[PDB]
Design a protein around this ligand. Structure first.
Ligand code: B9T
Lengths: 247, 13
């Protein structure tokens, strides 16, 4: 079986937010429900990562490191995909029972975080990203940052990452374009991958502030609280090497 | 330290 077909079969099942639409909306209420949904997505993302060919061959500490750095890029990228697929409009499709429509983005302080996520779906739509390109790109987001002193299994990681870079190349060629159009596409898709670092830095700035300010009463489930508690000191100590395809 | 994540990675799926 092809490598991208193995990435396809491990795609997580649909998760519902459990949002009661018969109760009026509020930013605090939506942010709370989405944090709960986010924790459930990250639990499913662990099960997803363990099934990615090569991932379980890395040292256990490296597996933890990669899921802890990439959490937000995985969630924003998968969200961008659902939004791009479910609507050719400015909607954020977090869950089938919780879509951030035009009315919900008028809610106080909603747009601030939403604009970063809208950029992801806007870019996938502008570039007309395929299902196969998307799967290769999502795996590459899991492998997009390492500690400043590298991983325990750095050599094996470099081999795995290069393998999925080639898989993105193979997915691109399938679009039946010429050699010049394929080089432009590879450039464009790897440029979008690079820009996810900036998207995530903006999402994390807001998210870290919200997590630390206990007076806001914004709840995070155990899975997200544990990732954030791990990540805040790592960013504070400059302990992160963001991998880029372009300078 | 990261109890829940280590558990999910170490448990059998
Ligand atoms: C962790 C993060 N918390 C925050 O950014 C916040 C608001 F609590 F600081 C949370 O991120 C996600 C949660 C669920 C999924 C899915 N599926 C994807 C993501 Br990305 C979030 C994002 N935006 C919002 C509202 C719309 C502005 N509320 C919660």
């Amino acid at each position: 079986p092809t490598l991208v077909s193995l990435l396809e079969v491990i795609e997580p099942e649909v998760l519902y937010a459990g949002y009661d639409s018969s109760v009026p909306d509020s930013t605090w209420r939506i942010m709370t429900t989405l944090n709960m949904l986010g924790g459930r997505q990250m639990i499913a993302a662990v099960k997803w990562a363990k099934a990615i060919p090569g991932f379980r061959n890395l040292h256990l500490d490296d597996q933890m490191t990669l899921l802890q750095y990439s959490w937000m890029s995985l969630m924003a990228f998968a969200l961008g995909w659902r939004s791009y697929r479910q609507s050719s409009a400015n909607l954020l499709c977090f869950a089938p029972d919780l879509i951030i429509n035009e009315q919900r983005m008028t809610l106080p302080d909603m747009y601030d975080q939403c604009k970063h996520m809208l950029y992801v779906s806007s870019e996938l739509h502008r570039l007309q990203v395929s299902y196969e390109e998307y799967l290769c790109m999502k795996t590459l987001l899991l492998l997009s940052s390492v500690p400043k002193d590298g991983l325990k299994s750095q050599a094996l990681f470099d081999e795995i990452r290069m393998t999925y870079i080639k898989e993105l190349g193979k997915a691109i060629v399938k679009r039946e374009g010429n050699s010049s159009q394929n080089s432009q596409r590879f450039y464009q898709l790897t440029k979008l991958l690079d820009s996810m670092h900036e998207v995530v830095e903006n999402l994390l700035n807001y998210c870290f502030q919200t997590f630390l300010d206990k007076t806001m009463s914004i709840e995070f489930p155990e899975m997200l609280a544990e990732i954030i508690t791990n990540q805040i000191p790592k960013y504070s100590n400059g302990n992160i090497k963001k991998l880029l395809f372009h300078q | 330290e990261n109890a829940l994540l280590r558990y999910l990675l170490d448990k059998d799926d």
